[PDB]
Amino acid sequence: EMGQGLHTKMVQVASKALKIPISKIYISETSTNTVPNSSPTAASVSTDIYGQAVYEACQTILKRLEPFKKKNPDGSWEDWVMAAYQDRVSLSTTGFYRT
Amino acid sequence: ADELVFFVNGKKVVEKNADPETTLLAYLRRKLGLRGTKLGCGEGGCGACTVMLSKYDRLQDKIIHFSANACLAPICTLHHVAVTTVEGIGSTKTRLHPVQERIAKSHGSQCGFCTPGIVMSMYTLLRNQPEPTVEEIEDAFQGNLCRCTGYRPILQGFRTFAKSPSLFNPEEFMPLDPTQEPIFPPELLRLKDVPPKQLRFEGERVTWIQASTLKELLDLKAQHPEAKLVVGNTEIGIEMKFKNQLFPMIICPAWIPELNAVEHGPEGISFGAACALSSVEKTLLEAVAKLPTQKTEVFRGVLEQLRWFAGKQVKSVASLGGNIITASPISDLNPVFMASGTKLTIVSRGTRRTVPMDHTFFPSYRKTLLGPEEILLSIEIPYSREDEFFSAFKQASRREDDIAKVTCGMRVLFQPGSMQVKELALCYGGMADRTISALKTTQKQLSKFWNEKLLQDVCAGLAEELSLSPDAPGGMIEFRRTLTLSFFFKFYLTVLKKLGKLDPTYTSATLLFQKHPPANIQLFQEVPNGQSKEDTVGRPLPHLAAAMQASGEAVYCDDIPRYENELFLRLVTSTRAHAKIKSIDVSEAQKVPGFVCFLSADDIPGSNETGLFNDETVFAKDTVTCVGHIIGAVVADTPEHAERAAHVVKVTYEDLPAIITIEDAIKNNSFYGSELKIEKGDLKKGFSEADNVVSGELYIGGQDHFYLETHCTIAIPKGEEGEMELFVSTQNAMKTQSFVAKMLGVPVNRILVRVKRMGGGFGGKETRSTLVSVAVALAAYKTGHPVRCMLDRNEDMLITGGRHPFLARYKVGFMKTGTIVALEVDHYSNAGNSRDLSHSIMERALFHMDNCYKIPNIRGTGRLCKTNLSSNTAFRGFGGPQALFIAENWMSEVAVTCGLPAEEVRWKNMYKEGDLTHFNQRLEGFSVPRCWDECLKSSQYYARKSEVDKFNKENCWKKRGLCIIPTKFGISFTVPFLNQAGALIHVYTDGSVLVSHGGTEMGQGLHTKMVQVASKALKIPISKIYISETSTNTVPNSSPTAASVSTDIYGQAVYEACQTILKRLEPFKKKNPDGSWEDWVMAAYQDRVSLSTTGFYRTPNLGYSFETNSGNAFHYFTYGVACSEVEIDCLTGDHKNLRTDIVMDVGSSLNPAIDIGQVEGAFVQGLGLFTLEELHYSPEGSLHTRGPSTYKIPAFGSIPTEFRVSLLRDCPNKKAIYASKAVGEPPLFLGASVFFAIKDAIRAARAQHTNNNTKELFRLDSPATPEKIRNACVDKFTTLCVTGKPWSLRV
Amino acid sequence: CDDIPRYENELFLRLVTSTRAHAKIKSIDVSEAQKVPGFVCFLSADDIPG
């Protein structure tokens, strides 16, 4: 983030992908121990390329929650997340994109 | 005066404003930034703060070097002293010193928190003696504690300084070269020449005068009679820190020659009162070597007390006069000086007297007869005359570095050439509020002769004159009275021997403690012959951080530098077991300089409701429910200010009825939840079929974790959106993160918890670390400043909970062959004031009540008692050791009842391959029989049993015992959902790899094992792989690092993340099969292939149900066997651990150095649980034992003298990572082999003096401390002493 | 970045830069720098460990 609103857009993207409100999503910072080998934030393409990587990670999370959603279609996001956790489903994933 | 000038690691320090209250430890850590020296206790017991000191001794004309506890050393005693810390001797950035290299390569560092202080104790020995004997090497560490290693590897590594594959290779060790050691600072050597001048230092609260001459001292004492002398500070340090004394003026007379002079006169050897106990010891050892035996009786009594006194660190600074004038009732020296009439020369300006010490010198508790302007100048310890004999004895809870239960000096002088008593003095500590003489008893014997009737009469007289009321401080009434007689008896027999210069069965009672030489053998499996050198799985690779631990470079939480605006928190805690809080007044606390604020329940912005079961407060509101219950916290600019202000917060209470003990709880129906039960088969039928039925009751005491690093959190508030980053000593970053979030009322995504390492956890940082973390977080939130808190040992022991005490009622039915047929055990744990992990702990207890035995009809129940004590928690074993102990106890009773050898009875009841447990789980790959057979053989159990019987026939007052016990321990979290693990792996474009996983390092070598796993999986050297730390923003929702499964589960997750990487790299590998790892990684990167992935694992096929008694509770079991032999002293309760042999099934070890260390470390914690460690509470529920002085974990001298460990060969475990098995907790119960060896020995003592009943069953609870062992050795002396002339008596 | 609180032992660096567009460096004299209160050290190419 250098002022251009990249984190904001990434939060909008994640919230649309997961179908939850932006208020449940947070970006704290950028660091080499969370995402390695990153290109510089440059060439105007950051929304394009991090938007896809974030969207791909959200799709993976949705696939993982999907059986819990079906067992409990009237439950909340919070219910399905807790069910996946008690079922020992990983709630952590990477996302990646290559133009 | 004003300036203080000393040296640290060769560099000059000029402190222009020395505060007399500043310790060297505080100075090193907070002013000089040298954090390798650690705080472990603050009271002289653990040695984690050990440093070397060097000075020019003018008077001896040489540079001397000695060790000292930085936590007790005032910087104001150090003018013109050169200090060496662990950083002064070597480092990984330059080169390790030989001491550091060896402790690291020999696997003598696990968590590493004790390592710098032990390095400095060994370094100091070497600077004094570059080629020490083995015995010198053991004695070097009487003041160093280690909770992790079991001591064996440290001693074995360091023994290379004296004179199966291997866990290390001493041929690679750099020899010591004294010519390369740092030179004594030349500036100090120039200053030696200038005569000293009086110095004055002025601090916030204290003025210190360093007196240069006797005349100065005597004048200062006239001018300021209230001024407190300080020499070594090893008593005043405690008074200041723990007893809240403030002495606004201190005079330190340590420089004065008259107070340091040693003079050999015709009546004895005179020592200046400031002479250190080590100088006393040295001079007397020399005298005993040079002089006739008949002259050195008193000296040898002094020496005998100094042997079992304190470490070298304390002895090198503790002055002789300091001990005399402190005048504790349990001084080990004052009874010796009193019984010998040792001469005290006492001075005042223009006055001077010499008096023999006698009973009047101690008028009352902790006072002597000196007046306020007098000082003790010198002490003349007398030569022994002809016809004069002397003994000193001391019995504590542990031999090394412990407070006497009873201690004494005994002198007799006969008419010339005769057995006719002319003088007799029996002087005791531990029997009143002062050192006392048994004058009434001894008076009656003058002119009597040394014979049986005198022994009987002195015993009867002591029993009467040295009475103790039921309420005597220290408790242990029967033991103490029995020791007073027992010590007289040893004296009486020793004096008979000395007079006949009789009965070979009695002679050992007269023998002074003697060290047998150590023998240690470790047996493990070589890796296959052609396994790649780069594949280190199965090799004895040292802990990756051991070299930095040895160097003081490894960073633990409080070693992290403070921010310039960082504040300090001190908890305010209940002094009542159960009370309403009436009011809280902070008006005095507000006046302490640097006070920032007092925090209490109203300050919390989110929820005050916390704890694993949401049954706790973050800060008590309205009521307190235990002593130590956290009420609030003070925040101030320094830890001293915070502590001072917290001390003066005034709480007003109104007591409520308290439920303290398991008995109170049962009687009051005060339980958490309902009964747990496992039941199989038909009990009525089994009992009705049994030939023999035994029932009983049994208790096992709790256990304090004693991690060398106490609990610690730093909380950094980021000032944006509720964000906070916390560095925490915890095994559970996830609950830390969510409890801090719940308290703040913010989403969990706001909170980052980072754990680099812990200096020990042992289960006590599984949940209870949050008590400190949530308070510190509150403080950071409220102030907007970084805040930290590290607990002092006494806060930690009181507040953070321990192992669960258990009471059991059992009934066992068996056949005359010893075959068990029915068993009922009702378990009760003392849970304290919240649920925490108590339920799962009781479950695991029930799961382990069979140990290794097939029992067709069985019913176990468990209740959790709800009490007004700190909530008890996970402690290595997690309920298993308590249940396994109850099981071996009835089993031992079965063997005694049947009159069968115990190993036969154990063997015939043992499960076989394929049996179901009582919870219907099948035992596959049950390796106990192999461990059992191989341990019998390699321990020479059978041959040794005959040797033990022989020893017992031939010794009336010492007995040996021998016992071999199996164990099995189920591997998995008993809560199914906990058995999951994540990893995150990145490969950077230089081809270096950063691994992160949900597990934490607490000394067990998890990261080491994870790097070994990733290296094997990726087929790259370990040098390319690195683990920095554990954090919630790299792996989320981690289970606590616990249940011994961390290697199994994180190993799988790491494995999987590597497989993913290998698959992404495979095309590049195919294109360039002769290229390097680096080539492939760069090509993957240039091809825009991701080099980052997660890995995950969930343990398959788990899910036990208590309702159906089916489904797998565990993934597999770890197994092992231990045989131990002991010798007990039936007259004192002391015992030696002679030999232990362990055979442990850890499958195909990933790292046999680390696995043997875990075996030995767990075993020794077990040994402490069952034989040494005991917590004492007042009847009102206030903990008495709050530091290493009174709570005694195994010392270096505690371990078995011959200590052999073997890892079972050819037992791959297909259920875990590379065929390995969990090791962390399974071996701890094996320390119960020492307890049952002790009980075997007690049975032999009781056959000797108590009973003819060879099927008698006497109750021995855990721990079997000297108290319990001596009291069970019922004999003519205990008979005279057991508590409880009426006008009439029925019959 | 600079809003992050400093550690209590945290030091400050000031770059020393060329006043010439293209020249040989003949010598560097730090002897006056060394007298400024709080001076800790001057760093240059030779201090670089890698």
Ligand SMILES: Cc1cc2nc3c(=O)[nH]c(=O)nc-3n(C[C@H](O)[C@H](O)[C@H](O)COP(=O)(O)OP(=O)(O)OC[C@H]3O[C@@H](n4cnc5c(N)ncnc54)[C@H](O)[C@@H]3O)c2cc1C
């Ligand atoms: C870890 C540890 C283990 C210990 N183990 C034992 C043990 O096994 N047995 C045992 O008996 N003790 C034991 N002690 C107590 C120890 O021996 C005493 O703490 C020590 O000798 C006191 O000497 P000091 O120079 O440190 O006294 P300081 O603390 O400096 O002074 C202690 C007291 O003596 C006074 N004093 C000192 N010099 C004079 C003087 N010349 N004239 C008049 N008053 C003076 C001081 O004013 C103060 O009241 C232990 C202490 C520690 C810390």
Ligand SMILES: NC(=O)C1=CN([C@@H]2O[C@H](COP(=O)(O)OP(=O)(O)OC[C@H]3O[C@@H](n4cnc5c(N)ncnc54)[C@H](O)[C@@H]3O)[C@@H](O)[C@H]2O)C=CC1
């Ligand atoms: N810190 C350590 O590791 C060690 C310290 N030392 C000495 O141990 C001392 C311990 O100090 P404290 O714990 O304050 O104990 P203390 O000096 O008050 O003595 C307590 C003991 O005195 C006896 N006692 C006191 N009053 C009595 C009474 N009215 N009736 C019968 N017995 C009574 C009992 O033996 C009790 O256990 C230290 O100050 C030090 O001098 C010795 C060994 C180890």
Ligand SMILES: Nc1nc2c(c(=O)[nH]1)N[C@H]1C(S)=C(S)[C@@H](COP(=O)(O)O)O[C@H]1N2
């Ligand atoms: N040195 C050391 N060893 C230790 C501990 C420790 O705190 N320090 N904790 C023990 C406990 S209680 C457990 S559950 C395991 C946890 O680690 P693991 O799961 O990697 O064995 O290590 C055991 N061995």
Ligand SMILES: O=c1[nH]c(=O)c2[nH]c(=O)[nH]c2[nH]1
């Ligand atoms: O093609 C580009 N490469 C960059 O490294 C860069 N940086 C900037 O925004 N524009 C670009 N464009």
Ligand SMILES: O=c1[nH]c(=O)c2[nH]c(=O)[nH]c2[nH]1
């Ligand atoms: O079943 C267990 N649960 C735990 O939470 C825990 N902690 C400890 O190591 N052992 C165990 N065992």
Ligand code: FES
């Ligand atoms: S911290 Fe100094 S001896 Fe423990």
Ligand code: FES
């Ligand atoms: S390594 Fe000694 S306490 Fe941990």
Ligand SMILES: [Ca+2]
């Ligand atoms: Ca509890």
